Design a protein around this nucleic acid. Structure first.
Ligand SMILES: [K+]
Ligand SMILES: [Mg+2]
Ligand SMILES: [Mg+2]
Ligand SMILES: [Mg+2]
Ligand SMILES: [Mg+2]
Ligand SMILES: [Mg+2]
Ligand SMILES: [Mg+2]
Ligand SMILES: [Mg+2]
Lengths: 119, 171, 123, 55
RNA sequence: AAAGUGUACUUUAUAAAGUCAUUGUAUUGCUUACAAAUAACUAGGCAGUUGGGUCGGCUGCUAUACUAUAGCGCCCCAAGCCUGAUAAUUAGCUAGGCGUAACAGCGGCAAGCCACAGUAGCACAUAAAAAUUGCUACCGUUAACGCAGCAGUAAGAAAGAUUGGACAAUAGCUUAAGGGCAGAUCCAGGUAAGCGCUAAAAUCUUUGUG
């Protein structure tokens, strides 16, 4: 489920996060678990293209923000897609709308119906 | 290798583009499928179609028209697992979660008699739709009761039904 | 015989190095300007600039000699001292001391006996 | 090689702080030595020019 | 250049930096002369051989010097070039070193240069490079191997050491997360160059006892 992309997981590349999101996660905010939560480090996705052969990997383009400021002049592809630890950071408006849905997902995981490790 | 700059992406796409149009293949596949294995192939076809559209530049729900046909084939075949997987990863397959689709899947599972599967579909659907219809909930409850009566002899089935009933009541 | 080199290397670096000229467990060193990739005691040099006696004497000090004028000349040309030569120059006040990186490895518990089997025979 | 950790604990903070100090110290050391070499380089060049004129 | 540059890569609630790619005023040099063992029971040697002219002699991207190593190669032209030449025997050279009042004579140690890696012909490799890189033929053992790397074994010879420990120090390779690798090297074992000391006790050394 797309709600499972909020919590970082081991061996979870950005490609899995991007693919399992509405509209391929265009215009979303993503960051790795090794980055400090208060450092304001994240990627903003502007364009996504799937792999020619595999069709399970994605080349993403966007902007890189450090301390809420751009680090480069023009959009560039994400060179660290293949690394692990990526997770989804919904915007405040999305967080408010997804409040009840997150509670439902957490309850299902707690009861054991949904296994986040498998997904 | 993909270009570093976004301004050079258009040239990269135009060179040796992969096959993108799979509507004809999917339509033929849906009709020809009569077993669970064919249903799995259709799911792979949906995934490839949803991923392939990005090369043209579309980011919409490509697999929005054949969802109903796939449900009908699954109900006739009698396997509900493909539908359970689809709802679990609805976005990944390019299917937009909607109430009419949830009702159709629940009715198909209820007709098959798998109340436990009906509860699973409803529970997964509740993670995409904020408000679940009360009439649909009653239908699933009836399906669970029918499932329990049909498979009352299996203790494991009874435990699964009880667990799903608690989940529906809690959520 | 041992004419000093005049042409500078074209594909390697010049360094200021310590040359072992001691006896059995009685080290003594000479500082010279030599090509980076050579034998330790090779006869190819540009100049000999100093000497060092690392062991203490009756006065409790170590003794070090160096050409002050020529050290500056070779440092200007591009000669790169080794780690130990930096320590000698830093303490002698020719150039500022070079900071060292932090260390985490548990230090060796047998440094003066691990490589001397004669002591281990008695141990 | 670089050190990264998903756990925001004291160990991670210590490694970052120590690395910053070492890099800052080394950068300052490099500037001082180069300035001395440049100053000495000018002095020897001037001496050679004087010697050439005398010859 | 112990440098600059980057729509590049990595680390940061702590940041300075490094990594990768690329850049030099002509963009990595040729030639000549002198010295160095025997040797005439080696007297003739050379025909691309000596010289001249056209052409070729590549890996670009300041301007001139009327083309600015070369029989180095093709074609053409003129007959010249060497003559203790040509052919043989022996040896790595310099030098430390040993004898001698010196002159001379001979060639164990530290280091510099050159050549080679079973034999020969080639490809890379230009500028600092082929023991531990390839292709082919051949020789010796058994499609493979060649210890003139350290230790070690067999035969030969009057006569040639352990199948040892350690990267702690010096030098080197890699790496900004402070590490990894190493028969160079440092130590030990073995062998009557050489140098030093011990092989007997003494108020339990009056540098004592207290
Ligand atoms: K040869
Ligand atoms: Mg010989
Ligand atoms: Mg050969
Ligand atoms: Mg070599
Ligand atoms: Mg041999
Ligand atoms: Mg040997
Ligand atoms: Mg070192
Ligand atoms: Mg004897």
């Amino acid at each position: 489920s797309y709600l499972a992309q909020l919590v970082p997981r081991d061996k979870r590349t950005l490609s899995n996060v991007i693919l399992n999101l509405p509209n391929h996660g265009i215009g979303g905010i993503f960051a790795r678990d090794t980055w400090h939560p208060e450092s304001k480090r994240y990627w903003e996705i502007l364009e996504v293209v799937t792999a020619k052969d595999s069709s399970a990997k994605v080349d993403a383009y966007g902007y890189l923000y450090y301390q809420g400021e751009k680090t480069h002049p023009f959009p560039k592809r994400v060179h660290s897609v293949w690394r692990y630890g990526w997770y989804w950071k919904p915007k405040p408006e999305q967080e408010k709308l997804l409040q009840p849905l997150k509670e439902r997902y957490n309850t299902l995981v707690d009861m054991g119906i949904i296994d986040p490790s498998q997904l | 290798i993909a270009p570093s700059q976004l301004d050079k992406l258009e040239k990269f796409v135009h060179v040796r583009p992969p096959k993108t149009d799979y509507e004809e293949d999917i339509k033929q596949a849906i009709s020809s499928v009569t077993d669970n294995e064919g249903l799995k192939k259709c799911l792979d076809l949906f995934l490839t179609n949803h991923a392939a559209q990005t090369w043209v530049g579309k980011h919409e729900y490509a697999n929005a028209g054949q969802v109903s046909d796939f449900i009908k084939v699954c109900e006739k075949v009698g396997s509900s697992a493909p539908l359970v997987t689809l709802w679990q990863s609805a976005y990944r397959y390019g299917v937009d979660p909607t109430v009419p689709l949830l009702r159709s899947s629940a009715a198909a599972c209820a007709a098959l008699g798998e109340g436990a599967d009906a509860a699973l579909v409803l529970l997964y659907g509740s993670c995409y739709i904020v408000n679940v219809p009360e009439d649909l909930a009653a239908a699933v409850r009836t399906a669970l009761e029918a499932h329990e009566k049909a498979q009352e002899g299996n203790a494991e089935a009874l435990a699964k039904v009880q667990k799903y009933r608690e989940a529906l009541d809690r959520l | 015989m041992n004419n000093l080199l005049t042409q500078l290397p074209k594909h390697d670096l010049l360094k200021i190095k310590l040359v072992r000229w001691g006896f059995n467990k009685k080290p003594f060193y000479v500082l010279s300007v030599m090509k980076r990739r050579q034998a330790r005691n090779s006869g190819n040099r540009y100049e000999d600039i100093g000497w060092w006696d690392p062991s203490p004497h009756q006065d409790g000090n170590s003794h070090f000699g160096i050409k002050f004028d020529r050290v500056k000349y070779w440092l200007s040309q591009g000669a790169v001292p080794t780690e130990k030569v930096y320590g000698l120059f830093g303490q002698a006040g020719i150039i500022p001391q070079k900071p060292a990186p932090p260390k985490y490895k548990p230090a060796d518990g047998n440094a003066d006996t691990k490589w001397r089997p004669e002591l281990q025979k008695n141990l | 090689r670089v050190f990264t950790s998903n756990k925001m604990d004291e160990e991670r903070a210590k490694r970052i702080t120590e690395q910053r100090d070492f890099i800052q110290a080394r950068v300052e050391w490099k500037k001082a030595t180069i300035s001395l070499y440049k100053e000495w380089r000018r002095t020897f060049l001037q001496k050679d020019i004087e010697e050439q004129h005398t010859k």
